[PDB]
Amino acid sequence: VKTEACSFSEYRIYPGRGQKYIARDGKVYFYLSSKFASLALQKKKAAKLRWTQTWRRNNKKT
Amino acid sequence: TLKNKMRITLSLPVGALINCCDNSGGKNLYIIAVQGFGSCLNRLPAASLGDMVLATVKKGKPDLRKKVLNAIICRQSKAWRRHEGYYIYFEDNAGVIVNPKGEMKGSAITGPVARECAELWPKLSSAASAIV
Amino acid sequence: SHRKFERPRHGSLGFLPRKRCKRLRGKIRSFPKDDKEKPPHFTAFMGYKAGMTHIVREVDKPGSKLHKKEIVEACTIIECAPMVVVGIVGYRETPKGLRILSTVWANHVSDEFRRRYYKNWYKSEKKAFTKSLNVPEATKNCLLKRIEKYCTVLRAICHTQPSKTPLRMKKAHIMEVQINGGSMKEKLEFVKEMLEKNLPVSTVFNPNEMIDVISVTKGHGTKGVVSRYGVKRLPRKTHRGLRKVACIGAWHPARVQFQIPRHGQKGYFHRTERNKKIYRIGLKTDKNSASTDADITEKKITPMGGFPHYGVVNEDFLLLKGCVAGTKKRPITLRKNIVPQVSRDALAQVSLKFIDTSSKIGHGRFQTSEEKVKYYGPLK
RNA sequence: GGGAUAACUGGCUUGUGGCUGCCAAGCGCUCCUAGCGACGUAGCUUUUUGAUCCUUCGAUGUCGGCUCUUCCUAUCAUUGGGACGCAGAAGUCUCAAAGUGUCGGAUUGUUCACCCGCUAAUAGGGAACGUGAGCUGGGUUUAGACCGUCGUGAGACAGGUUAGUUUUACCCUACUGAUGAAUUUUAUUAUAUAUAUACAUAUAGUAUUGUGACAGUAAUCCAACUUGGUACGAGAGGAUUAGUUGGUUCAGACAAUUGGUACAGCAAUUGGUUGACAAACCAGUGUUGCGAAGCUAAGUCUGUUGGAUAAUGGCUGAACGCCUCUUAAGCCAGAAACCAUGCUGAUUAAACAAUACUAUCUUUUUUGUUUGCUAAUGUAAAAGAGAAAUUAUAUAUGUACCGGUACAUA
């Protein structure tokens, strides 16, 4: 029915906003922003990202 | 076979060096010309995924060096808008060599392949490990 | 001698002069033509461009590569306050063109109508339309009879209601609308009965219709030839400049051959965009106005944070397929096609899957403020 | 000193070059002419090279490329056709056609040339040998230098090579945009109550709505599939035609949404400095990371159909008992051409219409108009400025009958 989830955040994927990267490994990575894309490009792990919901969950602050 | 193809953003100028993606023994493909390309003073010949290029082999088997051969692009660095509502792009640039009658010269396409291009050219869908 | 290699000329000769329009309001060049069998009806409407959104639509398109599968498309939103008819115009055919015989007015008019005539509404005694406050009803009837007898084209003098808008301007746009259909008498009866009422876009148009769009473009002032006409840029080596002009041309004419590209005005031009499909005609009192058969969720058309420089939608609105000429906030003129379009796409009936209401300021994901709050949770 | 005299344009001519002819001996199985066409012979042109020395030497900047626009047709392709040596598929000769298109490289000082490749095809020319106050300066062609040959020599060489300043628009016009008065020797396609009326109307000032003469113009080509492995063909092969879906080029917009963009703005960080500290500052934007928003494409949307026709295919049909597309009268259908339509402009019409309100003022009568000013005069046409059937033209108008018939009348 309604659109899929972001997984980099809780968010629904609203169309147009997202872009898709297919890696050499055959792995797709779906980005909901340029900011997310740059983080991925610089290849920096989630466990250093104090702002993000995954970090908050990782440190059990939800 | 339908050969119809909805527009994909222009990419890969001639002189681009792209992966050969098969057990042909080619490692790279240097695209020297595009087949079907329009007339224009300004444009370099430019190719999307579904375009048939003409290439030469810069690294690869010795017979394949010098000689000109057709290819179809399978992996592409530049993003395009798929009508499903997202912009798709690949990590690398790659195509697979073929005949001027469109018969396959490869044996097995090692990387992933854009799905619209794979269903475009039957012999690539057959040979392809994964559909994008 | 002839050029070694051929190459099409830069820009269209047919849209010289590339100069400023003399009115903010769109100007209809020509109206829809004779159809006696059709009943009388309005041809045109002014509305304000509020912004753009995207849509998800399910596609039929027989034999297409996409075919059955769903598409995502850009769309324009035009807030449409109901226009009010205030006058009747009677035109007559002459070998010198259409000429007005007379105009007949309503029995009262708006302040907003009167504001358009006054340059200094604030510092005036507002005496317009006060001898012409009333005349005998016999005089009015005689003029109507006279117009029926002799006139062969009927237009209605209509005006915008900017008081139903957030915009700085309080002056109405006043406008002629041709009425196309049956006999002059049947038309006259139609305009008279309609007169003092307010016309929603739903009273003028049907969803799925193809529509012609009349507007002045977004400005940019005086610009160089590269920008204005798109010529190939100068070499790396030059005595002077790089956006500096090419050769003007031959010694014969011993004058500048006018077809040459030149520096000057770019944008604020009058332009007709053709055949834009109406994807939805929205309703003012609907709180579900952005929702779809797939979504079925209470949700107004207004974006998250509203439209840029316009905010909330509070009146009826037109959801139009694709691009529209001019700035956001600009009045935009809708006209019916001069001959009705006949095509697959014209005949086709739109089924939306989604209408976006996300932000258009930043990358604000959320459809609703409620969704944003729900994500974030507790606050200080 | 020199246009008394070259190199540059132009000009005359057109030998030379190019293009088109006429013909009929052969070739084309067979067959003059489907296609050809000699031996011969006629024209046209100046994108050739010459011949030339009228024009300019108190200077017209001396090649080419780049860039940019327009014109031509002697059409290469796209549109419509005609012929064929034509079964189809092709293909070949040909006509109306200049609406539209005619590319990427490799090698050159290069027009030219020559490969490789795409293309749908990669036609040919003009514009002061298109285009140096548009550029460039590689080349011929200043002064330095090198090698060969020739010259006793100094030196010489359309012999080859390297190095070598490209000055000024602020004028007038042009063009592009941007403002803008003013115009009763001027206008009027009607006005007034089913009837009138130029011997007549029209102030002006603001403001809205518009009129639209006139000027400009635009959309473009290809592919795929289905028709159809059918018609057609002995087989091999193998369509016209539509239809559907796509793509190229141009154009016009637009920025939802991707990308691009930062001296809006937060964070980080290098070197120094304010005692530390938070706070901060400085280094022509110190430097990074993110970056709304506004611009923008490599992102997104949109880009008519009538009329009159051309080539042509035909019809009725004479001259000429028959025949004949008219190489007589009368006609018809017919093209990317043409004109409207559409769209853009319209202080391109010293243009105009309708509407709204207003300026002690308008209207009728009398007398006057032989410190810049403060009573005030101008007419291009008075002399009876007299005169509203109408299709006509190898016949008209009434009237009577049912656009025709009959009867009058000019």
Add this chain to the structure above:
RNA sequence: ACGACUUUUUUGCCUCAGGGUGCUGUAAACAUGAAAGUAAACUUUACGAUCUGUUGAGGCUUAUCCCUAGUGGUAAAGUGU
């Protein structure tokens, strides 16, 4: 560019402020919090890049963002006809 054009001039507008919308990424302050080690008492007391907590914190968001009849403001008084 400048004229010009679009507006509004108290059912407004400017102004700030609040909210919305966002953008950045968790401020200062404090922890007898954690922290590679260090030294000095007779197990206790010193020093310490850094990290976590208080803390989706702090900052910034019309300049050409949106909403608000929320605050205070809103003059000259000229000129042509």
